[PDB]
């Protein structure tokens, strides 16, 4: 519970300075035609559901993967990540395509180790998983389309009161009595055509993109102090994807959120989940309290949760917490490969089963959060 002073310059974790500094970048983006069937290579040794818009650091050591990355960059820069279900061993039916934007291949240790960062772009459902003898299987993928719905009032809209559908900008920003009173008249003036239909106005507000985004923002600001438009997009697709990425949920719920093709349904599901979720427990225990719903904040622009890589290449999704419970520390706080520029991580273990729940990040300089930063991963973390 450290308010006010949050001085960290919360943009370095989004840059991954631990993975090298002079990392070669790429100019821009790419497009795949919708509802089209493609062949895309699948890099192995990754088991995580990557929601679109989420950055993924990667270190690769094996010659087959390094060669796949090299000849992948020389022809497009897209590979595929499969959203594996609870069953392992390629038991996946949905997935996403990661786009390369940062690359560097390095020669120390007599190997051709490659460090690459990539962000999700599209969503697909795999038709058939054909395996190539080289070791890098290419999956027969169908591009899942993104569905955006118009206003629920557009069908029943009154022609005359169209000009009063452009609301003025919100008054000031994140201020009481400038939202409740504004939201009431916004609902009254937007859904004025709900009298033509057979349903009240609040029912149509339950299916409005703006209102659900506002409710999610309000509850998030209740959790941690958001900086108004702190990189949170106005586009409902992007906001829904960001919230799904930052939500502290398990794999099955992530797959369920990924299956949804409309922003509004995703927002409704997200609201239901984070209203019904209050605690996170130890997966190896299912009996110990480590966190809660309110003791969660963000030192990264991606939210409370983001993907990082240990020096061995394994990918961890880490959640930041003011104060954890039922944890013990072993080893002196070291900072050889810390993802946070200024902290010295200390490995954290369950006090009962001694499972790797996460790390404790002690501070080094005095003008920062004093040794109160729990980076717990999702290896043993389930909603309860």
């Amino acid at each position: 519970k450290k308010p006010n002073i949050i001085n960290f310059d919360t943009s370095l974790p989004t840059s991954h300075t631990y993975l090298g500094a002079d990392m070669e970048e790429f100019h821009g983006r790419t497009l795949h035609d919708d509802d089209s069937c493609q062949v895309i290579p699948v890099l192995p040794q990754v088991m995580m559901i990557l929601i679109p818009g989420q950055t993924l650091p990667l270190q690769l050591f094996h010659p087959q993967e390094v060669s796949m990355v090299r000849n992948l960059i020389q022809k497009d820069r897209t590979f595929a990540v499969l959203a594996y279900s609870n069953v392992q061993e390629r038991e996946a039916q949905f997935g996403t395509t990661a786009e390369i934007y940062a690359y560097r291949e390095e020669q120390d240790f007599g190997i051709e180790i490659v460090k690459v960062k990539a962000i999700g772009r599209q969503r697909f459902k795999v038709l058939e998983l054909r395996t190539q003898s080289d070791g890098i299987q290419q999956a027969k993928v169908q591009i899942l389309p993104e569905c955006v719905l118009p206003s629920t009032m557009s069908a029943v809209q009154l022609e005359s009161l169209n000009k009063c559908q452009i609301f003025p900008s919100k008054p000031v920003s994140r201020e009481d009595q400038c939202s409740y009173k504004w939201w009431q008249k916004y609902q009254k003036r937007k859904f004025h055509c709900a009298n033509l239909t057979s349903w009240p106005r609040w029912l149509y507000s339950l299916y409005d993109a703006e209102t659900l985004m506002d409710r999610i923002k309000k509850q998030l600001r209740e959790w941690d102090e958001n900086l108004k438009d702190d990189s949170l997009p106005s586009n409902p697709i992007d906001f829904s994807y960001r919230v799904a990425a930052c939500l502290p949920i398990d794999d099955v719920l992530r797959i369920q959120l990924l299956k949804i093709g409309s922003a509004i349904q995703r927002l409704r599901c997200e609201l239901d989940i984070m209203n019904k979720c209050t605690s996170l427990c130890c997966k190896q225990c299912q009996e110990t309290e480590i966190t809660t719903k309110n003791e969660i904040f963000s030192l990264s622009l991606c939210g409370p949760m983001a993907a990082y890589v240990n020096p061995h290449g394994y990918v961890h999704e880490t959640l930041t917490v003011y104060k954890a419970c039922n944890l013990n520390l072993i080893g002196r706080p070291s900072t050889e490969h810390s993802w946070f520029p200024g902290y010295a991580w200390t490995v954290a273990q369950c006090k009962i089963c001694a499972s790797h729940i996460g790390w404790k990040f002690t501070a080094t300089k005095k003008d920062m959060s004093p040794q109160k930063f729990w980076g717990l991963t999702r290896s043993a973390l389930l909603p309860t």
């Binding site: 569905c147 069908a155 022609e159 005359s160 000009k163 003025p168 009298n195 239909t197 409309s262």
Partner: protein, 1127 residues
Amino acid sequence: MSYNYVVTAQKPTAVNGCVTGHFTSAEDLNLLIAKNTRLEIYVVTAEGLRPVKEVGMYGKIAVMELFRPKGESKDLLFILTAKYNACILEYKQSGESIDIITRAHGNVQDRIGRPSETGIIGIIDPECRMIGLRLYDGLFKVIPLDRDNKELKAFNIRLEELHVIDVKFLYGCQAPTICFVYQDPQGRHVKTYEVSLREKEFNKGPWKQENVEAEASMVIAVPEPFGGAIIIGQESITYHNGDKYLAIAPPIIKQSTIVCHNRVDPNGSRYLLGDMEGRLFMLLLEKEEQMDGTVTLKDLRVELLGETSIAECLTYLDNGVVFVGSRLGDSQLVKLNVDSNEQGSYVVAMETFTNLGPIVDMCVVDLERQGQGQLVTCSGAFKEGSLRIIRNGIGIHEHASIDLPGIKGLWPLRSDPNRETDDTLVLSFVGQTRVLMLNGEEVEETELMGFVDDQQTFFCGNVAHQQLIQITSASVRLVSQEPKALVSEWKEPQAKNISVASCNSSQVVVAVGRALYYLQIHPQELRQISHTEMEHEVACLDITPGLSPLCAIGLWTDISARILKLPSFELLHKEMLGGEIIPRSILMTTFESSHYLLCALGDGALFYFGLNIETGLLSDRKKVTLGTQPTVLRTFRSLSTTNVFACSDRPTVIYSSNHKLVFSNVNLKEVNYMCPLNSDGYPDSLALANNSTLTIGTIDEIQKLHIRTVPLYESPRKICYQEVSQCFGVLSSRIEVQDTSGGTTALRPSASTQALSSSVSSSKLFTSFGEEVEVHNLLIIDQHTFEVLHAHQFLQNEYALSLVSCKLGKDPNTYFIVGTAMVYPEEAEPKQGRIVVFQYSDGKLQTVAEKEVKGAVYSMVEFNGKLLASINSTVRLYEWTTEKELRTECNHYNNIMALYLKTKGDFILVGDLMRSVLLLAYKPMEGNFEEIARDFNPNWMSAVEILDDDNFLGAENAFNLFVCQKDSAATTDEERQHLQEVGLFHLGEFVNVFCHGSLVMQNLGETSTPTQGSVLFGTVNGMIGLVTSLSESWYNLLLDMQNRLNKVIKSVGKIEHSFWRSFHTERKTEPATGFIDGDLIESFLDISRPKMQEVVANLQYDDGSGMKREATADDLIKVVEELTRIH
């Protein structure tokens, strides 16, 4: 495998646009009104509006404007469709033929682009040089206006301000100048551009951007000589012309925002305004400034004229008459007189046009005549909320009434020089014959000189050879025409009582007992023609053509119908007419240019038969239940050729349309006897005498649709009908302002505050001054007088959603079940609701049961005596206990909110606003729900209905209809669990409610109908539809005939039917499948003989053995006419 047939039973009524101008001709002034797909051209005159033309366009009119380019005599009409089918049309009439020729046509949509949030804006340069359309954000589309641009080629211009609220062309600019208000995070601004056609981009505006009010809503272009633009927002009215600038802050317009306008002067000196709540304002511009010939503003005084209907589109007609075009209320034609000022209101109403939309809910009830349905809707909103009662029948417009204690036959008589006019009518009383002579509007009785006084006359008419024949019970008498004295008295040979008498123009057949005598009318003589005898008594006899080839006689002792040669005695033909009862009246008519024998028995059944005029008679057997009383068939000449009035307990008018007799009811309770009476005072009238009084009036053309209004002055939400209580239960809501006293004061006398008895809910299971709060009421309305018998007010902050009138369990009582939800501004999703069960008895409403539920009861239905409720996203089943308390039985938890619930047998259909159709079945041996199938697709769903156990109908986004069915015969589980979609259609309307029923008489007809089932739906615009199922062969034949009709019929704007009916969505469009456009099929009857010959060449009409590749032309008539009788 659906093969549906959709037709419109009542065209949409809500108005969404109206213009005035010289459209039909340069001298005439016309009012063009677009209701949705229909364009009506009226003519403005001193008396009012004279309709001229009705045109159906293949689209929804989103933009309509009248423009007159250079070198044109009268204005042309530019219409844009919601599917972006731009067209330019011209009125062309040649004496009697009215046709609208399409000057230009073309789709103007873009391949990529999000449609604007403000919506389609279509504007025309006042100098008629360009058409500007704002269809997509950041792109202004421009269509040049040249005579060679017959394909409407348009170019896009990039607009830097994405959010444009309102844009219009300014008046008085050398180059085309647009002026618009746009939104920026810094606020709202007004900017102008100088559009150049040569280089196809914008330029610098005449006057720079000026900051305006934070709620600048609408822009109106002031014409010459003033120029500039007037910006109207919530709290200010401003005028901008560059250097010139003024603003006002009147207090009378702060109550509500102005949403519409219409100029009333050619020079723009005065302007007309309307707001949300429906009051007329009058913006006044002063031209008092004149320095050196320039005219500039001086003041903008705003004056409130009065209160009218909630108006969407104002239009000022000539000479102080305003057409108030309402969409959620009723269209009006009001007077703007400045000298009346009765109580402070400058407006008085002249007319009011019917407007059924929006139709929030409806029900089908047999109010008056058993077997025929009547539609009771919940129309209007706010102060225009009302109950429309729709009925199907021929409306007899009453003209006069008189008193007669049960007349037993009326007959006009001619005792005047030949002038083809009716002067006197003799009414046959119980024992006498009171000739109620009336040259004008008289009511006295003047006995005819040649007619008896008290003899119970059977027939009394004008015979040939200048005489009047009045056959009475005793003996048949005659009277001369010019002498007007009894010259001949044809006394019966046996001097008995004339049982049944039949009279014609020149021959009279009289039945005495079981014997028949025939006599021929001769000048001043009664010469008998023939005598004969019959085995049985003559129950009914009628002879109709100079000379009747045969006479039809019924047998009293045999109950059979025979036809015998009048100049002879041997019967020509005979048949057994059922034999149940003695026939009541048999007539021969030529309604369909044929020989038809309509015989009506005493039991109310017409044993319709077909006869031959030359010799003999066919059979063409037909039985129609015309009522439950012995009808008196009487053909009335006030019709196309002859018609027939079967006066009975259920009066009907029998008219032939396409050689197929239609039997349309009449708007009368019961008619004892009817007769034509073409009096001089009331030409082409009809005297119908009932059991108490005799009225004189005309009749409508054919089978209209009549609407009765019951205003409630508050919005009705749901309606249900209770048979045993003879009452209608309707939910309603009124807006009450929050005063600074802790109470809630109303705004106007509503139906809930004017009820005979009132109640307020009192339950215990659980702000700012000026705020409007909803107050919800349940009104009980009598079904006959339509007066509010009761009004129950619910608790504060309680919103009532659903309403079902049904009997639960073994309880004989029938109850009103209402599901409510406590809604608060603080929360978004309601957490608590209430199921309340009322029982209306003895004019008092009591709360039998009351259950508290944790959620909102979105819908409820009656499932085999068990109440089925939808609390939030859960479907629950409630059992009616013996102690009158609802008990839960089973639950089924969904991930979707069960907004829609429809049951058919044991098949529950659960729907939501995300088009997530779900299907359920209730296993009664186990008692829990189980899902059969599921069909999810992200889109907006308005309503859903169960067509049958296999198919389901629904309304989707962009005014579409879809049909989904489950393949229960599939051998794979994944196919069984999915609902295959096999029907798509672009209706063009927003359907709110689906209901089973029909508005026509339900007759089995032995062979039934080619259509199975019947579903009616009501839309926001106020259009009533009708969808039925078809067979495979019938669907294929209709589809082929529709395809051939597409190549013959020329549509206005040349919009292809397939494109118009293609399933449309912002994301993806598909061709229509599984649906037959009934409008196009019924349009086959309105085209000429050569066109119908062109349509049918190889349809292979016959399906019952053989093909008959010729297919004729009248076979399609026998097809379309049978398809027209369903509505």
